[PDB]
Amino acid sequence: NASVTFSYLAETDYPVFTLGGSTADAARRLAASGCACAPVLDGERYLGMVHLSRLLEGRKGWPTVKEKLGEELLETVRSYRPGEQLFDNLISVAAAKCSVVPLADEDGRYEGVVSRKRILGFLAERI
Amino acid sequence: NASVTFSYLAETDYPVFTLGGSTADAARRLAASGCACAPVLDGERYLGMVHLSRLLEGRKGWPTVKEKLGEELLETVRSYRPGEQLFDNLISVAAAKCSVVPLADEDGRYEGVVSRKRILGFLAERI
């Protein structure tokens, strides 16, 4: 399977937020969905990952309606093109803080995520 | 390679809770630590995994002050012995809901966890 590309495991049924959007919404959706982190877009462009731990940092409750998803909240980690080879990149994917890595095309347009869970499921059948 | 055991990747710096403990504290600790789920013990004995999403189910924000961590909240998923072979069990580990699997000895004493992150990092070195 040496030539298998990130596209193979792409998922779009994963929480994704928009820059300037509701942080209360974001925190709730992350916590409810079993995800510690999710991509944040500006229009179509992937900008960064936001972590539930960061949204709840310092406070005792949940974000209020007024709180906005700023760029300062994001970890602007690398993305992968859907057409990149998965097996050229396992070291970096294993090292990523978030258990999914974001996919973006050549213009930076978000194309979903790939999870460590699905990568391991694929490898387990062939290792 | 072939004969590597779960023990090799075992981690004990991972959140762990105790039966009857504060659910609001547990939920707060999960969210602050970047973990969606963690083991719950009765003494040293592993009982099951608890999920942040389960703890928040039907709560507005945090669990109430009086709520205690009871066994009906747990996913009583399988554990692995530290001496079991990793390469005999990748399919089930990849399939687990939680991104970690609990280790327990022959008597069910909790011995840490093994994460999908560490397993993938280990594989990346040899694929």
From TrEMBL, chains A, B:
Organism whose genome encodes this protein: Chlorobaculum tepidum (strain ATCC 49652 / DSM 12025 / NBRC 103806 / TLS) (Chlorobium tepidum)
Name of this chain's protein: CBS domain-containing protein
Signal peptide span: none
Range within the parent protein: 2 to 126 of 224
Sequence ranges assigned to domain CBS in this UniProt record: 14-57
Cysteines engaged in disulfide bonds, as pairs: 37-98
Domain of life (superkingdom): Bacteria
